[PDB]
Every structure is written in structure tokens, then in C-alpha cells.
Amino acid sequence: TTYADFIASGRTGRRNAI
Amino acid sequence: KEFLAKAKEDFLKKWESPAQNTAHLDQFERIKTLGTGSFGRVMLVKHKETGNHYAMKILDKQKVVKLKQIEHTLNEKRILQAVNFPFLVKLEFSFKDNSNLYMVMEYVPGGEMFSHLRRIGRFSEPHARFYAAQIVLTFEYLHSLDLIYRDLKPENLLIDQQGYIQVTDFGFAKRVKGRTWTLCGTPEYLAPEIILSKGYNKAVDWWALGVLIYEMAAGYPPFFADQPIQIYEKIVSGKVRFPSHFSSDLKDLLRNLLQVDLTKRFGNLKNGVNDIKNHKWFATTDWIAIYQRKVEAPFIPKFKGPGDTSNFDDYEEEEIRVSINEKCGKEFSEF
Ligand SMILES: CC(=O)c1ccc(O)c(C)c1
Numbered sequence: 001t002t003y004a005d006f007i008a009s010g011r012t013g014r015r016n017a018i
Numbered sequence: 019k020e021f022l023a024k025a026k027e028d029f030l031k032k033w034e035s036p037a038q039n040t041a042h043l044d045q046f047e048r049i050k051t052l053g054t055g056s057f058g059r060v061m062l063v064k065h066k067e068t069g070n071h072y073a074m075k076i077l078d079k080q081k082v083v084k085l086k087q088i089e090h091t092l093n094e095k096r097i098l099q100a101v102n103f104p105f106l107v108k109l110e111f112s113f114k115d116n117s118n119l120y121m122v123m124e125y126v127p128g129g130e131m132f133s134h135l136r137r138i139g140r141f142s143e144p145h146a147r148f149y150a151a152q153i154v155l156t157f158e159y160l161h162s163l164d165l166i167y168r169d170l171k172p173e174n175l176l177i178d179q180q181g182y183i184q185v186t187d188f189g190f191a192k193r194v195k196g197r198t199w200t201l202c203g204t205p206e207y208l209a210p211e212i213i214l215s216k217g218y219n220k221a222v223d224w225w226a227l228g229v230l231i232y233e234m235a236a237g238y239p240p241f242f243a244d245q246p247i248q249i250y251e252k253i254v255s256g257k258v259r260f261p262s263h264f265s266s267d268l269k270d271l272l273r274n275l276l277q278v279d280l281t282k283r284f285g286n287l288k289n290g291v292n293d294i295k296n297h298k299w300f301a302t303t304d305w306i307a308i309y310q311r312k313v314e315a316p317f318i319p320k321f322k323g324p325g326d327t328s329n330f331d332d333y334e335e336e337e338i339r340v341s342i343n344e345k346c347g348k349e350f351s352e353f
Contacts, residue, residue: 002261003139006238014132014173015204016055017190018246 022162025102029163032100033193038353041111041122043340046074049325051333053130057082057091058118059336062125062327071325072110075121076338079346082119087189088349090202094188095121095353103159104309105152107176107184114353116341126184128177128319129329131234135172140237143265145316147300149175150231151308152183154300157227158291161220166192170226171204172233177329181315194219205246206239210278213250224285224294228275235268236261240276254278267299 006012046063049071053060058077065072082091098109098121111122131149135141141149153170160167168190176184190202197217209225211218232240240259241252256278260269271294277283284293295305307313319329 002259003237006242009242010244011206011242012136015171015206017169017204018202 022159025159026163028102029100033096036096036352037099037112039113041113041120043113043115043120043338046072046122048074048338050327051335052327052330054333056085057087059333062325063122064325071125073123073125075123077119077121078117079114079119079350080117083346083349088346090189090192091119092350092352093192094190095119097165097191097193098188101160101163101165103156104311105156105183105185106159107186112353114350116344117339119350119353123186124184126176126178126186127321127326127329128179128181131172131175131177131183133329133331134177134317134319135234135237141234142316143235143268144302146231146234147303148308148313148316149183149234150227151300151303151305153185153227153230154291154294155305155309156185157220157223157285160191161223161291164193164195166194166198166220167223167226168192168203169207170223170230171207172230177317177319179319179321180311181318182311205249206233206241208250208253210254211280213254219286221280221283221286224275224283225277227285227294228272228277231268231275232258232260232272235264240272265299267297267301271297271299 045066047066049062049064051059051061052073061074061076063072063074077091082088095112099112107126108124109121110124113120169187174185174187176186178184192198197219199217201212203212207226207229209218209222212222229239241249243249243252258276274284280286285291287293304313321329
């Protein structure tokens with residue numbers, strides 16, 4: 001599932017601007 | 019018609035004669051760090067003479083220079099002192115010392131949208147439409163003053179005591195007539211034109227609204243991956259997938275907001291924002307009651323008291339050291 005992929009991804013924490 | 023007319027007259031006067039040096043560090047009691055990042059942190063403080071609590075953003079001038087954010091920083095404070103809108107966080111004071119820049123803002127104890135969205139998983143469409151409406155009104159206000167916001171994300175939206183949104187972080191906000199080119203923002207939220215360096219305008223903010231709305235209703239962004247380059251490839255590729263629980267109207271809105279075609283991206287066409295405001299997905303929204311804060315919030319934060327910070331994460335505290343020599347004084351002269 002996309003949700004499961006997200007949760008296991010390295011981007012679910014606060015995201016820094018570039 | 020144009021409430022914006024009045025709006026703009028008040029902004030322009032503050033814009034040309036911006037407030038400066040309106041407090042000093044010793045007038046505040048430092049309580050706890052509410053958030054941190056690139057050029058400095060945000061602290062809960064207490065105004066000694068009134069007992070009011072505030073959020074104080076501290077930027078190390080040396081770090082701002084190192085990151086080439088001087089102009090952006092002057093933009094941030096000049097604009098934030100000049101604006102006024104129900105869903106825009108208020109700047110109460112600003113000042114600077116030998117080492118840092120300080121922006122003393124309204125304390126919004128309900129924490130970040132980011133925190134509650136990740137915790138709860140995803141929002142209900144009505145719940146997400148309540149927030150979105152607030153951002154649609156804010157963007158039409160900002161864009162009417164020729165401002166681009168450029169940093170929309172749940173991390174930057176705070177939830178107040180009434181369950182309404184307060185937009186923070188004007189670090190990339192810019193008064194610009196026409197188009198601009200800076201590569202800035204957050205990878206998940208960038209519009210195609212930014213990634214492709216085509217030069218861009220306020221349309222980028224309407225795309226970002228597309229990402230936010232999707233993220234809120236689905237619980238994850240429309241474009242994600244473990245590294246930013248992959249995220250750019252996805253955004254640039256003209257393709258979006260939607261959860262099967264998204265209602266038809268919402269997919270249609272999002273298809274028009276996450277529109278790689280500027281000529282067709284919603285809010286960017288002949289009808290402007292009324293293209294968004296008039297959309298069927300917003301069918302049940304009283305835009306006026308939303309502004310006047312007369313709608314009932316879906317969610318109301320719990321705070322066991324004043325200065326209470328359970329809605330914010332814990333951050334390692336660091337001391338605020340002030341040098342004995344003035345740093346980068348000429349660069350931040352107008353702050
Ligand atoms: C992070 C930021 O800019 C911020 C601004 C106002 C505020 O009340 C809080 C809690 C944070």
C-alpha cells in the first residue's frame with residue numbers, strides 16, 4: 001500500500017526546505 | 019467587492035516605513051525550544067512586563083550569511099511586520115543584537131498541523147476542506163499584495179485555540195511583480211516550473227495548495243521518495259495517483275491544481291482564485307463565515323494551561339550566546 005510505503009520511507013518526519 | 023483595496027493601503031504604508039527595534043532580549047523570559055532548523059530556533063518566551071507568552075524566532079546572523087539567506091531574511095521581517103489577516107501569525111516585536119536577529123510572534127499553542135496529521139494518519143475531506151479554505155483566503159490576500167509565499171507545508175501551519183490555522187515562516191516570502199527564479203521551498207511541495215528553472219510566479223503557491231490538500235486527505239504527499247532528486251522526477255513527470263477514497267470532486271480539484279500547465283493551472287487562469295473558490299469540492303463552504311471564524315472547527319487542541327507545550331515536540335535546549343562584538347552589522351542594517 002502507498003501508505004505503508006510512505007511510513008517506511010525516510011521522509012515522514014519534518015521536511016527541511018532547500 | 020475589493021476588501022483587498024483597504025488591505026493593500028494598510029500594507030503599503032507599513033511596507034515603506036517598516037517597524038524596527040521594538041523590544042529587547044532582556045524583556046523576555048526564555049522557557050523552551052518549540053522548533054529548530056537552518057539559521058536558528060523558535061522559543062517559547064514570557065514577556066516580563068505583561069506576563070504574555072510569545073514565540074521568539076532567533077536567527078544567528080553568521081549562519082544566515084553562510085546560507086546566503088540575508089535578503090530572504092530581510093524579506094521575511096519586512097513583509098511579516100506589514101501584513102494582517104486572520105490566518106497569518108502576528109509579529110509583535112523585532113530586534114537584533116550583536117549575534118542574532120529576533121522575531122517575537124504570537125504563541126500558537128495548538129502545535130503544528132504536521133504533528134496532528136501524522137498522528138491521526140489522514141484527515142476527513144470536510145476536515146481538510148476547512149483548513150484548505152483558510153489557505154485559499156490567505157493566498158488571495160497575500161497574492162493581492164504581490165506576495166509569493168513559497169513555503170506551504172503542514173509543518174508551517176499552526177492550529178490555534180479555536181482550531182483555525184495560523185500560517186508561519188515567511189523566510190521565503192517575497193514581494194515581486196512579475197516572475198522570479200530562486201530555487202527554494204520544500205522538495206515535496208515544489209511546482210514543476212521551479213524544478214525546471216523556467217522562472218515562476220504565484221502559480222507555484224496554487225500547486226502547493228494542491229500538494230497540501232492531497233497530503234491532508236490521503237495522509238501522504240502525492241510525490242514522495244527517499245531522496246529529493248527522485249521526488250523531482252515524479253513531480254516533473256506529469257502524473258498523479260489518488261487514493262480510492264478520494265471523492266470525484268477532490269480528484270478534479272487536485273487535477274486542476276497539480277496542473278503542470280500554467281495556462282490551465284487553477285488560480286492562475288483568467289478567473290483567478292474564484293476558479294478555486296467556486297469549485298464543487300468547496301460546494302459547502304461559506305467563505306465569509308470562514309474568514310470571520312464563524313464556522314465550527316473539526317478539531318480543537320487540548321492544552322492543560324497557559325504556556326503549556328504538550329502539543330509541541332521536545333528539542334535539545336541550547337544557550338543563546340551573544341558575542342561582545344557586532345556581527346554582520348552592515349548586512350542586517352535595515353532589520
Ligand atoms: C515556527 C514558527 O515560525 C512559529 C511562529 C509562531 C508560533 O506561535 C510558533 C509556535 C512557531
